[PDB]
Structure 1
Amino acid sequence: IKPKIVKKYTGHFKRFDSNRFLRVKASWRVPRGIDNRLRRKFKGTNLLPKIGYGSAKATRNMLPCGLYKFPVRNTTDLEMIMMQNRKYAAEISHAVSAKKRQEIIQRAKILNIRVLNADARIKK
Structure 2
Amino acid sequence: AVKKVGKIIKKRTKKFTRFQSNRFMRVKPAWRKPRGIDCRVRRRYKGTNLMPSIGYGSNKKTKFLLPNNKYKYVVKNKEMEPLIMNHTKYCVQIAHNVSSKKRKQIIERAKQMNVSVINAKARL
Contact 2:19 2:49 in 1 (8 A): no
Contact 1:3 1:59 in 2 (8 A): no
Deviation, 1:46, is 5.5
Which residue does the alignment assign to 1:108? 110
Deviation, 1:7, is 1.1
Which residue does the alignment assign to 1:16? 19
Which residue does the alignment assign to 1:45? 48
Deviation, 1:44, is 1.3
Deviation, 1:56, is 0.9
Which residue does the alignment assign to 1:84? 86
Deviation, 1:109, is 1.5
In structure 1, C-alpha distance between the alignment counterparts of 2:111 and 2:34, rounded to whole Å: 50
TM-score, normalised relative to structure 2? 0.91
Q: Structure 2 unaligned runs (5+)?
A: none
After TM superposition, what 4+ stretches of structure 1 lie above 6 angstroms from structure 2? none
- The CA RMSD measured in Å over matched residues stands at 1.4
Between the two proteins, what is the percent identity of the paired residues?
55
TM-score, normalised relative to structure 1? 0.91
Letter in 2 for 1:38: V
What is the number of residues matched between the two proteins?
A: 120
Bigger proportion of residues as strand: 2
Q: Structure 1 unaligned runs (5+)?
A: none
